Amino acid sequence: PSRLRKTRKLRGHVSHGHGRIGKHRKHPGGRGNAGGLHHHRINFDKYHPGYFGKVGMKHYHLKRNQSFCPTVNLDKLWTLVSEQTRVNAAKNKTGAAPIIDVVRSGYYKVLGKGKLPKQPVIVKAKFFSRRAEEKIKSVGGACVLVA
Amino acid sequence: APSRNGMVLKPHFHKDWQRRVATWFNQPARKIRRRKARQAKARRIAPRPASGPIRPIVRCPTVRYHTKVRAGRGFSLEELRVAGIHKKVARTIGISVDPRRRNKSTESLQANVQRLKEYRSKLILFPRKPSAPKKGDSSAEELKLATQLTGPVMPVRNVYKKEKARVITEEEKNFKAFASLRMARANARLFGIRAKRAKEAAEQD
Amino acid sequence: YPMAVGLNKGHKVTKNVSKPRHSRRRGRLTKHTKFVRDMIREVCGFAPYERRAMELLKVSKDKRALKFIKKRVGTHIRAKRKREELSNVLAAMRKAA
RNA sequence: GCAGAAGGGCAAAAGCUCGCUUGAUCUUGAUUUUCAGUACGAAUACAGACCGUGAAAGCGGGGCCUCACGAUCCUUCUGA
RNA sequence: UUUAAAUGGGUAAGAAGCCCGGCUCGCUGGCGUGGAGCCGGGGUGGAAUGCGAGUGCCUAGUGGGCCACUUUUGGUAAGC
RNA sequence: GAAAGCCGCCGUGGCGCAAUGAAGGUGAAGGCCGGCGCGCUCGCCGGCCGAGGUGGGAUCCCGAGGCCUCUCCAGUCCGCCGAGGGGCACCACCGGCCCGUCUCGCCCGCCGCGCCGGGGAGGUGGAGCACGAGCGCACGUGUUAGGACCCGAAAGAUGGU
RNA sequence: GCCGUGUCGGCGGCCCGGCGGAUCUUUCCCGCCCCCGGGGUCGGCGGGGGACCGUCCCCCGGACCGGCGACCGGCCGCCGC
RNA sequence: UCAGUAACGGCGAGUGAACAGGGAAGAGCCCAGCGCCGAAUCCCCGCCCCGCGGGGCGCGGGACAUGUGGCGUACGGAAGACCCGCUCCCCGGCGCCGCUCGUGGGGGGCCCAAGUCCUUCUGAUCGAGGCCCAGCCCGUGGACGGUGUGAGGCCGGUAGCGGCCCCCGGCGCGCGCCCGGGUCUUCCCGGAGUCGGGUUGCUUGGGAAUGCAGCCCAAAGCGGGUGGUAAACUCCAUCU
Numbered sequence A: 001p002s003r004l005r006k007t008r009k010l011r012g013h014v015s016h017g018h019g020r021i022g023k024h025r026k027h028p029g030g031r032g033n034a035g036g037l038h039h040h041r042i043n044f045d046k047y048h049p050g051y052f053g054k055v056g057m058k059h060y061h062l063k064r065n066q067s068f069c070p071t072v073n074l075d076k077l078w079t080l081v082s083e084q085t086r087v088n089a090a091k092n093k094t095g096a097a098p099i100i101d102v103v104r105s106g107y108y109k110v111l112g113k114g115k116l117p118k119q120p121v122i123v124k125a126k127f128f129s130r131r132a133e134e135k136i137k138s139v140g141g142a143c144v145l146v147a
Numbered sequence B: 001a002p003s004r005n006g007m008v009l010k011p012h013f014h015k016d017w018q019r020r021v022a023t024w025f026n027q028p029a030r031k032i033r034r035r036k037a038r039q040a041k042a043r044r045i046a047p048r049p050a051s052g053p054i055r056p057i058v059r060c061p062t063v064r065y066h067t068k069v070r071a072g073r074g075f076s077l078e079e080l081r082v083a084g085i086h087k088k089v090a091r092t093i094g095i096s097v098d099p100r101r102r103n104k105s106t107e108s109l110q111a112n113v114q115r116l117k118e119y120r121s122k123l124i125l126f127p128r129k130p131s132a133p134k135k136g137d138s139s140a141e142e143l144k145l146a147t148q149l150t151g152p153v154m155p156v157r158n159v160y161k162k163e164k165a166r167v168i169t170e171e172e173k174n175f176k177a178f179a180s181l182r183m184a185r186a187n188a189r190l191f192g193i194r195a196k197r198a199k200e201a202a203e204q205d
Numbered sequence C: 001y002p003m004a005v006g007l008n009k010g011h012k013v014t015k016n017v018s019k020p021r022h023s024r025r026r027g028r029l030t031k032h033t034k035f036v037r038d039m040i041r042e043v044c045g046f047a048p049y050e051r052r053a054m055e056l057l058k059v060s061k062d063k064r065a066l067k068f069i070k071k072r073v074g075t076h077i078r079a080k081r082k083r084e085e086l087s088n089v090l091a092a093m094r095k096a097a
Numbered sequence D: 001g002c003a004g005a006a007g008g009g010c011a012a013a014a015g016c017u018c019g020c021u022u023g024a025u026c027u028u029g030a031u032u033u034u035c036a037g038u039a040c041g042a043a044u045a046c047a048g049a050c051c052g053u054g055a056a057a058g059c060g061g062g063g064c065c066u067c068a069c070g071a072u073c074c075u076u077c078u079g080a
Numbered sequence E: 001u002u003u004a005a006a007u008g009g010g011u012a013a014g015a016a017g018c019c020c021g022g023c024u025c026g027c028u029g030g031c032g033u034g035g036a037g038c039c040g041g042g043g044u045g046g047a048a049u050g051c052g053a054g055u056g057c058c059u060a061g062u063g064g065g066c067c068a069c070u071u072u073u074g075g076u077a078a079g080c
Numbered sequence F: 001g002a003a004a005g006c007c008g009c010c011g012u013g014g015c016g017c018a019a020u021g022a023a024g025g026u027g028a029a030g031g032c033c034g035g036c037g038c039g040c041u042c043g044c045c046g047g048c049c050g051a052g053g054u055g056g057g058a059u060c061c062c063g064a065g066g067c068c069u070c071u072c073c074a075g076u077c078c079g080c081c082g083a084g085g086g087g088c089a090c091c092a093c094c095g096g097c098c099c100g101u102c103u104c105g106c107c108c109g110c111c112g113c114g115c116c117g118g119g120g121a122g123g124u125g126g127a128g129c130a131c132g133a134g135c136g137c138a139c140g141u142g143u144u145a146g147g148a149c150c151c152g153a154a155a156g157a158u159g160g161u
Numbered sequence G: 001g002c003c004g005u006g007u008c009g010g011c012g013g014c015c016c017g018g019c020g021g022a023u024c025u026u027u028c029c030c031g032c033c034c035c036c037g038g039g040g041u042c043g044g045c046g047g048g049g050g051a052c053c054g055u056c057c058c059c060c061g062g063a064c065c066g067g068c069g070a071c072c073g074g075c076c077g078c079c080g081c
Numbered sequence H: 001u002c003a004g005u006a007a008c009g010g011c012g013a014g015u016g017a018a019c020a021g022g023g024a025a026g027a028g029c030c031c032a033g034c035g036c037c038g039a040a041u042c043c044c045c046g047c048c049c050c051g052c053g054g055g056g057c058g059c060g061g062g063a064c065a066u067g068u069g070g071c072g073u074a075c076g077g078a079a080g081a082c083c084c085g086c087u088c089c090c091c092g093g094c095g096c097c098g099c100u101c102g103u104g105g106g107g108g109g110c111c112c113a114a115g116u117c118c119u120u121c122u123g124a125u126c127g128a129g130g131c132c133c134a135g136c137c138c139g140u141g142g143a144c145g146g147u148g149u150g151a152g153g154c155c156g157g158u159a160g161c162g163g164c165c166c167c168c169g170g171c172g173c174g175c176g177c178c179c180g181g182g183u184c185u186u187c188c189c190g191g192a193g194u195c196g197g198g199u200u201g202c203u204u205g206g207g208a209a210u211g212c213a214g215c216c217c218a219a220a221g222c223g224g225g226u227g228g229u230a231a232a233c234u235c236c237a238u239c240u
């Protein structure tokens, strides 16, 4: 849309949006991210702290599957199953607990986040944080680990 | 060259890049070229299906992906051995063979042995001149269609257990917890050392 | 009680016990071939990095006789398959006498 | 007179002399000083130990105060 | 330097203030002592003049200046 | 028509919904009432609830009172309304929670009693939570990598005449 | 003759509606493993039914305007020949 | 996609992979060596079989080759002797007859309808008109030239339209080769100046050397390679 952009409205002004004095040439501060410590220090400080140096252990050839663990915290603990069973199996004729597993829903770890409701469930995951299991064991549900 | 707050950028155009560029102005032309090589191939051969052989069921390599099922390469002989067909007979019947594939489970082995005989159940052959060595009558009353599509026996079938509902018992609601992992990990990095501290008690003499 | 982390990791599956592959058997001695290489160390002889190595092994040092093969054959674990069979041929040249 | 350059400041003292001594130590922050309201530097009040001195109140984390000093990366050491 | 202006700089001119009643504390400790915090209750008009304000985002240009009373430093002096 | 439409048991994946530590790893809920173990500054059981609280806070609600041709017999309405209420977003603040650490003190657990686990109270570091706002497309502006607004060297290198 | 959102009923087609649901179904259907030529579901598997929930399709009853959902006759008041 | 990520770098400027995972296509095999078969192997030469535009099995003569040709054989195991239960195939060509998939490919010549009336212009391809069938053809209104703007005047566009010629893959007589399968028994089982180490140059993201190359040292057989921090021990994983 060259009708809409700037250079039509500026076409006729001499210096073309760049000033008489400075007179925009090509590269007055060097090409790229030049001048890290020398003469653009105040730009790299105050907007990018931490850019200069080592911090940690080198780790040759990590493979992004060994440390793969997704998290459902307990807000989303009932989006896994249908709404059809969070009320149909909510009737305490006896301890009719539904199971909920997350490793068929693409999740490995169950973390904690507030308001697990008052239905006793059995929740299957490979890892439970100890706030999450004490929200399941304090609504009368059990927390069955699986692999 | 940088100004007020922004990303720091390493754009990889310092190298010469305008002499290797690849516009895909032929990717519609390459799609309807390789549909002619599926139209005029699947009709040219046979009532044999398109999309190749029967592939077996294969479970993925990454911890990330071991929970799922994939169309693998070939039934690795053993599945040709428990089901009992000859290996060089198998790849003209329409059964893929991958000899460098191993089986270190009995759970996964019978998961393809039933699959292979199920393929051999839904197979009909054409004997040459109708003396019929070990094929039945007229051609399964007819071939019923010309070609099959997108895989023989639907190689995904990512099935899952129902596991309907249960009563929480006494043992299940007291034990199996987070502290059963912190001591489980503590028998992973404090196990070899405790083999060595018991050698200290066998040299205490 | 399955668990994905710990000592007994992973999904509990049964294991197939089966005859190993035939490429897995590469360097068995296979008596026909031992007959060749025992016939050949009396028709050909030894090398001059091991004519000297036994005459340090029979007398002076066996650390240094290891440390002489260590320098002249590549690895340390190759030199514990030379030294303790240089000594064996020296044994059956000594204790067959 | 107070190590030295000046200026402020100092009297049963901040000077001299005697007696003891290691607060010139260990640790988190906040604040001031040129300041962009960034850093090093120096400095001010604190809080937690552990100590010294004094009969005691207290006073001390360097010199009566204002200067006396130095990043990344790398090397060296010390700590669980 | 005893003294010491003119011009000048900071704060203040209220309801976010005052007062009364009651609880808290692991601080302070002759002492319901001190001091903070929290809760409820009673009373608005608080120098003159003028005026609609607060608040965040992205940011171009610029980073050679010069002149004049006035006060001034170096200079014999200057359109220095 | 090198379009357009469809797939979803092609959502693999990308970015987002969870952060933090060098790392192993860990990983964001409170408020009240009853009561109890020596209510020890420390602590525990049953229920209701449920993102805590102070100050402002547009809007909305209640609203004493005021409003018409004779004085009583009344209605939806309208009109200002002193005070008072529920207070969106956002701002200042106090409180809590997660993780790294630091100091201080006891308590609890046992696929099996240890140079094991789990914990509590205060202080701090964090690109966090405290009822999510992102993704995709398009356009404008700004800043860079690209011959990069057009035109400009003294030079440098390779291969040749 | 109309259609909006509903209660039900006739489940009327569910076993000759459509589609879902990590609802429910070891008395159901074969091929498995476990157990001394056969059995015990003996627990689940791969497969294939049908019972049930939620939502849109014919009927009679019920709701209000009959609204761009319209034809009919009836009226007033136009208009043209 | 992983990912402008691990990693490299006066750790500055900047460069920067791979495995997972989803797709396109998916075809597998041969030998040396260890062994059995009395070289059962091949080339050239000459004759005739008899065939095209020629290539063959026959018939006789010179070579290669035992320093090792050909059959079976390849690490997924193989070979022989058993025993038992099934089966005689496949392979190319041949003049040819029938299909061809857009109905194969190539070539040439053909296939709808207005110049009818008025009118303007130098010229029409313009303007207007064609009763009630809408003047006419439309599977043909793409385009092009034609005295100017043309569905109809002409090439031609449309059509699983025809006919004509030449070549493609696939009938059936005369060719030519021609027993596999499961258990048990025994026997065989593998590539060296190569692998690796020391050093030196280049290179890479490869970082206590990833690859490459030189020079030196130079292997073993339960051996060897790899397992992304140098190393020793100890299991294991995978590969040959």
Ligand SMILES: [Mg+2]
Residues within 6 Å of the ligand: A018, A019, A021, A022, A023, A024, A025
């Ligand atoms: Mg400029």
Ligand SMILES: [Mg+2]
Residues within 6 Å of the ligand: A017, A018, E060
């Ligand atoms: Mg600009």
Ligand SMILES: [Mg+2]
Residues within 6 Å of the ligand: none
């Ligand atoms: Mg996009």
Ligand SMILES: [Mg+2]
Residues within 6 Å of the ligand: none
């Ligand atoms: Mg030159």
